[PDB]
Write a protein that binds this ligand. Structure first.
Ligand code: 4VY
Ligand code: 4VY
Ligand code: 4VY
Ligand code: 4VY
Lengths: 546, 546
């Protein structure tokens, strides 16, 4: 029967309540009990604070009116306010201390996942202080998780006026008995309850959550840790840059701060970074997640030599030039990781810092052809199969749904033997026609990749493997160099192709290399262990790339 | 006969020459004359410096090799190096001090405008120092002005080896007698001259420029100040954000640093900021130049109410939310300027700073309808003409070339009377069918706007004028507020519609308002006086929006 949940911001979604700092300021400054709370409510509906909450005046205009109220209240109480008494200082510290109440936000996110319509209904102000960015950042993090945000200063109404509850019901398209309303101020619940809404008085979070569980029949407390926030492709800013007449690169962009370029592997997309993009932007970075050349909405020319590392790296430099970025942090995975090590070796001035997931830096051997080194390792047999143009394309393009369902699996769900691929005659020869869905991905996520590969097929992506000799000759020019800029290597325990053991001599070439290791993680690092990848990247970015 | 000009970077396009700091370091540290220059060239083609210039090793690997060379040279000279002697400190200070030689860059830009192919051919290194960004920024500013940039460390060859000159001629597709070559090092000219190229030894800039003038027949010295760098639309990064199901906003993006959002007026485009975009990005800002709703590649729904200020401002807030920007500096002109004042009044937390070109902030009068205020001023008569849907569209869409040629004119070139528009029956009734081209714009620039307005016509743009009453009712909610965030008002002397006198009472509402004034400037501020607009905005951004 319940289908909507409304939360207050102050004292419910964000703690501590700014209204609660008045009480602690009185105790600390030895002022009479309730003095600051009386100055705050001085005048009722015609008072300065109601004008502030309705949007009539801004926070900076209200501050000197609250100071007059503090002096008028002190005169009647026969007391004096300290010499260094400042409403501005008190409110700046209170607003700054207020952080998201993670268990409450998690309960709102869980209710929304179970079909509920969620909203924030709050009494708030137009913040024009020099420190207003701190509040703006808080509202941005919260608003993306709610269907509606109704702020008093924008609608010209305040709680507890009954018109704001009528406006709320109209916005929700719901009747009062279908709505749960959470607030920490008793007076604000009274009108919601007169209409017939379920009300919860929030004193402590745990008791409020227990009441919320009992009334919704959904478990909110003691539940498992949720996955990080993912991207909705239709909500992203899409960017397009022409790097050369026939080549245009597509990317998705989120955040402000130092530029971080994400480079996916084979056969993937910018969408393989869906769990890292919101996390990295929230950490204070401007994230650019590319569709590499040959993929998705980026150009996919047919010529093999359009995908050799020298051309790919030069186009990435042109990409930074056209965007007006002197530097970017480069983070790659699989083929993208191979590219980011070569960006650091050939264009160090354009690379702020470099990180690779799974892909180690392996220097070229001038005495041995790379095609002969691939034969020496039986797990790289699928790369010999990828050499002849047209062969692997026909198999991989035959059934796109089967291709992605067979590839994107956790280490214990594997359905492909990566060795004896050539001898067997294919990649999917001993594979089921209808593979089960992996616990790592949803059907909707698989369909995104299917839609992307319907456009240009596998020719461009497979050409990344068909320049072994050209790449070898190019890399041989860098054998005398070392990587002396900040660098991170992240290994994945259960990647049976790019094994952690293949990275063990990297310190000889990158002496100050930092490391990360992920246990129980397969090849598809980003979607296998997203919380762990995020934590490793954010910690390294904050210390070495800033 | 001459058709190509090649310049060296160090000592020619950038001064002072890093190679010249060795001489001044010797004089300051009382070291024997030429000691540091001998350590620098120690070994010839097999020496550390040649390996550095060929790209074999990076700058950080070369530093300890140059220190050994400094000690070996001091042993033979029977002298001692000071206690705090550091090659790293000497090179960091030398690279940092090197700035663009503006008269030389201006001469290269002039030669390129006259049909010459220009190139930089330089002996340079792979910079991996922690301070490498400074060099990266320098190379980015320079490379956009040249057809080719050939760096020794990328091609594996150095000057004076004859193969680098052969490689240069092949890249230029020119024979030696068609090439002018400028270098400050005599030894580097010798191979160019043996091939038959015209060579200029650069000791001082003025004498080199006089020699260059005599040999090309083009005046380079004493010439007028050139216009700021403009945008080539096909070289920009284009971004697209869906703010609501039927509405997608297009923007162009350049630079890194604090976000600056540019909002054009009627009937314009993101292209009206072509002279500000490279200047603002070079100053250290991330520039987002919008196609406002109804224009160019942004959505243009037909409904009138889709263009009222309340909807337009809310969509600009959603635009920041989808890009992950908590704040942006908002700069507007004409209708865009009207929008940026309302963004500051209703969403101050999202606005870092606000600037308007020509458009003053005029508060709503609750006693007077805005339609009656427009009749009181005869110069706003064209706005009454714009009220009836379909009428102004038919006239403005009839001949697009004529429409833009008649509108985009300097103050002394006007061909339209803005009063008695309704009585005359149109805007172009007493206007020439084939107006002359204004000195402000080229034919190519006019054609860009023609192409943009061929897509959605004038309905969307004209709807910005058809919400007078709705905007008035909305603005009346903000009559009790003041603008207390950083603000700039720039007036244009010869704007006969948005006269500077209309801004005189703005200090009552924006007490800390900063001002700018442009003499001999008409309505089309950005393209009329681009150098002056840039200087005013950059100075204000550096002091108030950072
Ligand atoms: C990134 N990979 C594994 C592709 O499946 C890679 C990179 C370089 C070479 Br050589 C071989 N494999
Ligand atoms: C690179 N590929 C696709 C080969 O068809 C790959 C890599 C790791 C794992 Br596990 C599976 N496939
Ligand atoms: C920006 N302008 C001039 C348009 O030509 C403007 C703005 C608001 C009102 Br009301 C009238 N004109
Ligand atoms: C806003 N317009 C277009 C009216 O057709 C305008 C503004 C200033 C000058 Br000058 C000319 N036109």
């Amino acid at each position: 029967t319940l289908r909507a949940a409304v939360f207050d911001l102050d004292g419910v979604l964000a703690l501590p309540a700014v209204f609660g700092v008045l009480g602690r300021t009185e105790e600390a400054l030895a002022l009479p009990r309730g003095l600051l709370n009386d100055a705050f409510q001085k005048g009722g509906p015609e008072g300065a604070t109601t004008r502030l909450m309705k949007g009539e005046i801004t926070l900076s205009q209200w501050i000197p009116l609250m100071e007059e109220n503090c002096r008028k209240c002190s005169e009647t109480a026969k007391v004096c306010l300290p010499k260094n008494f400042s409403i501005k200082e008190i409110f700046d510290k209170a607003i700054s201390a207020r952080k998201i109440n993670r268990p409450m936000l998690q309960a709102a996110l869980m209710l929304r996942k179970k079909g509920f319509t969620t909203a924030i209904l709050t009494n708030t102000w137009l913040d024009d202080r020099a420190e207003r960015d701190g509040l703006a950042q808080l509202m941005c993090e919260l608003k993306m998780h709610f269907d509606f945000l109704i702020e008093s200063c924008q609608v010209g109404m305040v709680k507890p006026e009954p018109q704001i509850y009528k406006f709320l019901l109209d916005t929700l398209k719901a009747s009062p008995s279908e709505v749960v309303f959470l607030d920490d101020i008793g007076a604000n619940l009274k009108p919601a309850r007169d209409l017939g809404m379920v009300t919860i008085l929030v004193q402590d979070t745990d008791t409020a959550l227990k009441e919320l569980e009992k009334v919704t029949g959904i478990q909110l407390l003691n539940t498992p840790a949720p996955l990080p926030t993912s991207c909705n492709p239709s909500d992203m800013s899409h960017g397009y840059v022409t790097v050369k007449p026939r080549v245009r690169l597509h990317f998705v962009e989120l955040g402000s701060g130092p530029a971080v370029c994400l480079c996916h592997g084979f056969p993937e997309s910018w969408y393989s970074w869906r769990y890292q993009i919101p996390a990295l932007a929230q950490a204070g970075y401007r994230v650019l997640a590319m569709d590499m050349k040959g993929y998705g909405e980026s150009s996919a020319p047919p010529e093999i030599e359009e995908y050799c590392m020298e051309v790919l790296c030069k186009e990435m430099v042109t990409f930074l030039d056209k965007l007006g970025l002197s530097q970017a942090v480069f983070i790659g995975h699989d083929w993208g990781g191979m590219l980011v090590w070569y960006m650091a070796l050939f264009y160090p001035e354009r690379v702020r810092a470099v990180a690779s997931l799974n892909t180690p830096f392996i220097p070229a051997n001038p005495n041995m052809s790379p095609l002969e080194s691939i034969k020496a390792n039986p797990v790289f047999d699928y790369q010999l199969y990828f050499q002849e143009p047209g062969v692997a394309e026909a198999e991989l393009e035959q059934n796109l749904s089967r291709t992605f369902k067979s590839l994107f699996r956790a280490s214990d769900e594997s359905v492909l033997s990566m060795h004896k691929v050539c001898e067997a005659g294919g990649l999917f020869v001993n594979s089921p026609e209808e593979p089960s869905l992996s616990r790592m991905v949803t059907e909707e996520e698989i369909q995104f990749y299917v839609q992307q590969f319907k456009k240009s097929g596998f020719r461009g992506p497979l050409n990344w493997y068909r320049n072994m000799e050209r790449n070898w000759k190019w890399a041989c020019k860098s054998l005398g160099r070392k990587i002396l800029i900040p660098a991170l290597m992240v290994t994945a325990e259960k990647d049976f192709v790019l094994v952690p053991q293949m990275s063990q001599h990297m310190e000889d070439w990158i002496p100050h290399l930092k490391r990360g290791h992920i246990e129980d993680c397969g090849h598809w690092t980003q979607m296998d262990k997203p919380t762990e990848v995020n934590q490793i990247l954010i910690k390294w970015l904050d210390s070495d790339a800033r």
